[PDB]
Design a protein around this ligand. Sequence first.
Ligand code: J60
Ligand code: MG
Length: 421
Amino acid sequence: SDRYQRVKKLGSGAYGEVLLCKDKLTGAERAIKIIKKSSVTTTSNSGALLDEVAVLKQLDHPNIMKLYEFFEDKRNYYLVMEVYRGGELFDEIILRQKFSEVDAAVIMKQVLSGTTYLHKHNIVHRDLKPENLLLESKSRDALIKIVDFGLSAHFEVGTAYYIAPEVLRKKYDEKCDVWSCGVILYILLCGYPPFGGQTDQEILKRVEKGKFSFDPPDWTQVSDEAKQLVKLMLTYEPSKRISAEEALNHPWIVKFCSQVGKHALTGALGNMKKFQSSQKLAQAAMLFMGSKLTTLEETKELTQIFRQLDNNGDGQLDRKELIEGYRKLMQWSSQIEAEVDHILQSVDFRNGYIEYSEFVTVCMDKQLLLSRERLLAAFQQFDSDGSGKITNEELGRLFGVTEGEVDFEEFVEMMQKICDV
Ligand SMILES: CCN(CC)CCNC(=O)c1c(C)[nH]c(/C=C2\C(=O)Nc3ccc(Cl)cc32)c1C
Ligand SMILES: [Mg+2]
């Protein structure tokens, strides 16, 4: 009943899910965020909201996400945005064999130019983090695109490393983005966050205290200009913190963007590889457990659905009935659903009238088997030593940010049984 055809989920953003969709008109792919109106409280009014939307539609900067369309109906708001296929910035950094302060400045000039442009348009990101730094494509010269900013003044519904102390007190302005930028920069220069901890609670307590250091051996050979910039961006008092524009024009950016010898960041890069891979493995594990719970829920639900459609109570359904049941699971357009059911009837199978419980298992086993192969990818990027095992300590960092050795098979079993316990 619209213009877009859903292809798949890309992931999550502030206030809702982001779907890869096909524009039926031109065939072009778009990233579409859906904000379910029930999931938000409006803290302003429709005119104020639509005013920001009009500003968001006008943003045209090389380092800033483009917004094509904003529309709505009774249930949802829809934001139609560009798809970026270069991946997250830090996932690309950790593929490198070398990294210098020049490289760090070339990155930060882009982040700071975009952030300066947002602030000039009175737009605040408010949750700026590396995952919101997307490479536009796989092109060699791909630009960093900042995504997911805006709308914080209009809606109310890891990431703890990047949050300004004033945001924790819910009394902030655009200066909060400068702090997040300063955290990202700190990590670029030494490879670990300035405010650490094993849990969100621990991290945030360090954030609110506001103390950090430039420790040896990491910070020894870092330029005086870089440390000064970090200090200015991580100034505790928002009113005394430098602006995005002043950071952009800071001597460190000017000096290092005019060009890797005297200012290599080899140790930083090694740390970043460990930092990013462990973060991505925690994320993958959370998503896997997330998927396992959803699969068990939808299993029981689809069984109840099919049971109601089973008029004679023989535990069997034909193709058309199966489709009707699949439709009802989504409710808890028709052209796409028939494909998934038919492709699922391949393993199910000829007779035309099948036991729906078998359809249920085969349907969800394909969900569980798909979940593993996504966790596996993250496990492989994490497995920097040749062991193919995760230690109890590494596993402690994982579960301690989630809710003497173990291989991938044992790891999966440890998580699937945790979804039972
Ligand atoms: C479970 C792994 N999953 C892949 C399905 C997460 C990895 N992310 C993506 O593949 C992805 C891609 C290719 N693009 C995006 C997100 C985009 C995107 O491409 N454009 C865009 C604009 C605004 C906002 Cl808020 C978010 C986005 C994402 C999250
Ligand atoms: Mg029947």
